[PDB]
Design a protein around this ligand. Sequence first.
Ligand SMILES: C[C@H]1COc2c(N3CCN(C)CC3)c(F)cc3c(=O)c(C(=O)O)cn1c23
Ligand SMILES: C[C@H]1COc2c(N3CCN(C)CC3)c(F)cc3c(=O)c(C(=O)O)cn1c23
Ligand SMILES: [Mg+2]
Ligand SMILES: [Mg+2]
Ligand SMILES: [Mg+2]
Ligand SMILES: [Mg+2]
Ligand SMILES: [Mg+2]
Ligand SMILES: [Mg+2]
Lengths: 208, 209, 482, 482
Amino acid sequence: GKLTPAQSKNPAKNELYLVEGDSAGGSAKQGRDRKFQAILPLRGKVINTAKAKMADILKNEEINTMIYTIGAGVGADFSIEDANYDKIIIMTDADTDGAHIQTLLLTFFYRYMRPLVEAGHVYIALPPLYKYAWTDGELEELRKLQRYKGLGEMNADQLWETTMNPETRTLIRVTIEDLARAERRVNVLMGDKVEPRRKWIEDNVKFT
Amino acid sequence: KLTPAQSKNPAKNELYLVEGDSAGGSAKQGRDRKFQAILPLRGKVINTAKAKMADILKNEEINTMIYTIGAGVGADFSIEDANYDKIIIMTDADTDGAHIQTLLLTFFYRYMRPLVEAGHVYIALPPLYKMYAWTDGELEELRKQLQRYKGLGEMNADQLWETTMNPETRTLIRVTIEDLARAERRVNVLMGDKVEPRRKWIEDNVKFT
Amino acid sequence: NIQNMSLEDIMGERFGRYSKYIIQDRALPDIRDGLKPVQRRILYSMNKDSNTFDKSYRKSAKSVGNIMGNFHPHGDSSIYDAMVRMSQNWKNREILVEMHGNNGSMDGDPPAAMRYTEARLSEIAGYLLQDIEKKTVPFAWNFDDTEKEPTVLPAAFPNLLVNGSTGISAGYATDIPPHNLAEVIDAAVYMIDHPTAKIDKLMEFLPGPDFPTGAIIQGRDEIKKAYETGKGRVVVRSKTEIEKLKGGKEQIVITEIPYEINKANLVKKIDDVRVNNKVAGIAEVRDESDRDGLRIAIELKKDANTELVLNYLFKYTDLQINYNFNMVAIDNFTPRQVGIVPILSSYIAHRREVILARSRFDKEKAEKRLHIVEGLIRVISILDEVIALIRASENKADAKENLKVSYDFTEEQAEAIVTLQLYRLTNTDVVVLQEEEAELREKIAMLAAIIGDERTMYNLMKKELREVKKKFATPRLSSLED
Amino acid sequence: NIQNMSLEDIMGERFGRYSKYIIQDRALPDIRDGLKPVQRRILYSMNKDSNTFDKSYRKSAKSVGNIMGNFHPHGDSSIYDAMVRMSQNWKNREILVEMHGNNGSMDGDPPAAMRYTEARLSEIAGYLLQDIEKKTVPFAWNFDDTEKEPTVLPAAFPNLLVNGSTGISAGYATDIPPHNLAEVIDAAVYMIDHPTAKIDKLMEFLPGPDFPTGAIIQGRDEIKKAYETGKGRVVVRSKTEIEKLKGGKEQIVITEIPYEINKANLVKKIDDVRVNNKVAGIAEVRDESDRDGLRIAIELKKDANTELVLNYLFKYTDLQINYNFNMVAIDNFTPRQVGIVPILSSYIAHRREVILARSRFDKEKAEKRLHIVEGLIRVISILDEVIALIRASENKADAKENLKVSYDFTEEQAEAIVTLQLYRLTNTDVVVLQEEEAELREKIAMLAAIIGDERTMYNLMKKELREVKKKFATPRLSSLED
DNA sequence: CATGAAT
DNA sequence: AGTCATTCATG
DNA sequence: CGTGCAT
DNA sequence: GACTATGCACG
Ligand SMILES: C[C@H]1COc2c(N3CCN(C)CC3)c(F)cc3c(=O)c(C(=O)O)cn1c23
Ligand SMILES: C[C@H]1COc2c(N3CCN(C)CC3)c(F)cc3c(=O)c(C(=O)O)cn1c23
Ligand SMILES: [Mg+2]
Ligand SMILES: [Mg+2]
Ligand SMILES: [Mg+2]
Ligand SMILES: [Mg+2]
Ligand SMILES: [Mg+2]
Ligand SMILES: [Mg+2]
């Protein structure tokens, strides 16, 4: 068990935290409310569930233990009522690679647990950028300063107050809006074909 | 784990027991692969005087040492059936290297005496200084006609071979048990269960100044 | 070619080297500042890099790297782990390093790797280093021979007793528990006035150890044996309370646990007692500890004997353990089993050398300056002559000789005068210099007294020890029971 | 409490964020200096710390830690591996880091961890940093907003082509092989004189890649194709001799293998061919490489068709491989596929900016100085009244004011005059100063020309490129074949 | 199937 | 102080 | 068995 | 980034 479980079993208020890294995973375990919050450290970039084969995809530790810790199975053999959490919360570093990780998890949950993302069950924590403020605008209102480089530089105390506490936190809630233009986006950014992607970048990415 | 010699010859070939995998690599690079084999020892070796023969048979470093030396261990030890003519302990010149030698020596003494009695167990002598000098005295002489080496990990493979592995360029201590009784009371006071005797040996022989 | 050596000879030689080294320079603390060498280096290095409490955190890896390349030629993991430990407030009564990030827990889970965390010296660590720039403490060359490092720190509080140490070398080991900072200082202050004081009296100021982790310490008798001989076996019992629950069921709640005990294991072992039904009545075990408070709840069954359960957990788990003083420290380069008196007096003697050195250094600085100031006071009244005499000289050295020969300035006064910047011929106030002159004479006299009178210097030690106590004192955390 | 975003939107702000960064700031070399950000930071940081070719090796871990804490907010493994790679002379045609200790091998055995090894910049790496102190390159704030770092190095040699780069991001990868320094510089020099030069002509100077590992490169037209378009497949083949062993047997001896090929894996795969008898003939495989020479012996059986065996090994092992150009670099903040022409031309424009900037910087220095020397020459003509004036001034600021108002000195001259040490008044030799005034005027003329005249500047750039070549030129390793 | 900065 | 796996692009 | 600097 | 084993003294 790489997992740290919630003390009492309550699929109605229970929360699963997928944290980028064992290190941040530590602060998450320490800062949490253990009654209803579980912690699952993801160790390394998550496998791309579009590019890889459903063979290797199911032989993956990070994937395989989420398939189990979540308790609903995967694919079409998947019941959303046998689940274990009301909210699955992805908590990554506020960096580029955290962005990348959010991306590889989102595509897994879309490709292989679509109902969970469809019932608005999958979230994304928003750790603070500054010391608190999240926007470049919110720091100028405080101006009347430490810049956070990772959750690994965050104390368990602070992590709670700022991003884990359901009273003092902000979670982006993933909602599959237009299934078809959403399917185009995942399949173009994460698919086997490079040229589509390259062009999507050439077209949407402002280098300057 | 082991890096074998290229050709089998129990009369020439050498076994380098090297402190740690990193220096293991520098010796794999600088060796003469035809007759020199490298077996890196990962970590502090197991005190075979303080521990059970059971837990001792369970130790990786030991198990793979009795195996590449290929003559079994203990009282079922047949030297003729050995694989090398020279077993060479090559550690850093730091205090911990001294310790690792200590441990290994008390193994070859307790469970492979014949190999140490026949003078087949040696100890390499890496150079302390690079201006190369081994003794502080040789140091003041090179300055006539400085990098102070902190371990084998600061030496380049070409540098290694040149100073310590090359059979022509090197010096070696040959461990030779000269008095069986006075060497038994010595490995026992130092490496054995009883702690008081050791404390007193330290108190009597080690000058703190 | 080769050279033969005896097994008995080679072995003795080698183990000699390892023993001496691992005793003087690894596993055992210096009796004066209470630091193992790797701990001294961590502090010294961070302090040299200005990584103090009053400045920004700084990435741990950077600190460990500088430590490893300037002072401590060993693995980064040993250095980082030691650095980490000094930041853990359940291992140190007075933490010497402040770390941001996952620095571990009472559950013994891994600290973040040194790439994740940031650190700086704590404010009190500052006091171990105080006056280190003032030649107060003997320095030695580092392995490089590139840089000098301190062999002991100034130690403006008695770190040995306060934070403890432990402790495993060759032929000796060491365990010294942590103590309340104010109590240790009270003892020291008494012993400064009463150099022959005996344990029973010191124990009126220093009643026993004071763990960061709190709990109850039982054994006034063995504390004395320990404070007297260096060894002793005292008891340490978890602070506990009982809560009433609905349905006439009582609940055992633990809020403090014994020093050095891993909370997670303890909670499993207790739960093992329930699972194995080793004593009757245990409904469920639960860690309820969270970021602001330890709390293990042991819920009991309905008609369950809460006295039986509590007692059994005390005997057969680590809810209560024995703690064994084995106070060994390096004194005059060799290991020494020591009681409170060798410790406190070694500390007092060390604080003495430090204040004497500190005072000589400052006196010398003040004299040199005073000498310049006397020169400048004289110069102002002959300003134009001095300017004219300088214009008349051929160059720098000729100017000085002319200053000496014509007005009897000393070499040092002339050098100072001749290297003033033109603009100082405007700042021409003799009364301001006279104020400095007086301040300096007064300062030199205070310092002279310190150097020339053992009582005046001991008074200065007491007055400082008290400033530290006033500034850093905290309440006992562990209770004592005879 | 909660705010919604679309799956389509989330995956857009994220993958864009990541994509942009991996392309600009990770996997892809800057087209001008040929460095990925991690390598530039490595070089910049070690150079900031004086850890240069002419000074003692410095512990790897110290260097890495400083890079991490000051410039590069990532793991030490990655920094260290990057630093180690820049020191391996079978991966770099011209190594930029010299490392003492196990830094790996062609057999791909793990380098010693950064606790063992020590490092410093190579002399040639010095030439990548030449003039960095002269405000020659654009600087940005580090991740930390604490310190400035360079966004590109001065690159006094064309490192992109000389050392190469590889090369995997998002939507783009890069593979640019290494070339001979003298050759690449000959091409740059021709192009400086003949800007519109065509590939055919450039290839008279730069015939193709030059691997540190040597070997044989076959494919003149694909080389040309790659120099035009940045893409091309060439063949790279081991240097092989045959040796007639006694008793009618032959033996194939390999002595240079293809770039990026693990010697040991290759030797094992060739022996796999023998153990599996995929083709008949191989008697024994024997790696005979020592510390000073690469040598693999493939001994053949009596009456073995050596051409058949060789050809089979060429096709079914890495005894021979295809090498694919995919020259992508970062030009004006964005990824570009580029042939030899845009590469050399970007480099040339870069050196232009650099040299222009260097020259503005030195000229600025020379002027500030000339301006002061002019004031001093004047002061000496009026010393007596200038000292009088400072004597009459109320303080520093009033003295400067009075010097401006009464004698027209500027601020900068006033500052200099007023901060002179008294002993300077002993001098009255205007001649020494006038010699300096003249040398500065000449110095300023040379620099100002360079700035105002494109041809003078390009000559300097050629003159400097030829020096670099004369100094660091070495012979081709890899033979070329049509 | 490697490659090399990233997790 | 090795060892394990993942991204990304490419032939 | 577990402690903490070491390999 | 976690995991894996040893030395050394001591109840
Ligand atoms: C010196 C090397 C020796 O090998 C080590 C271990 N092994 C010993 C041999 N066993 C077969 C496998 C495990 C180990 F378990 C942990 C460490 C470790 O923490 C460590 C460090 O520098 O912190 C360094 N080393 C370790
Ligand atoms: C960020 C961590 C993530 O975990 C890692 C690995 N695992 C991923 C999970 N697997 C199930 C077990 C192995 C790994 F094999 C290697 C590395 C590694 O080299 C490394 C580094 O900093 O250089 C860092 N990490 C690694
Ligand atoms: Mg990060
Ligand atoms: Mg060493
Ligand atoms: Mg370790
Ligand atoms: Mg007990
Ligand atoms: Mg790695
Ligand atoms: Mg091939």
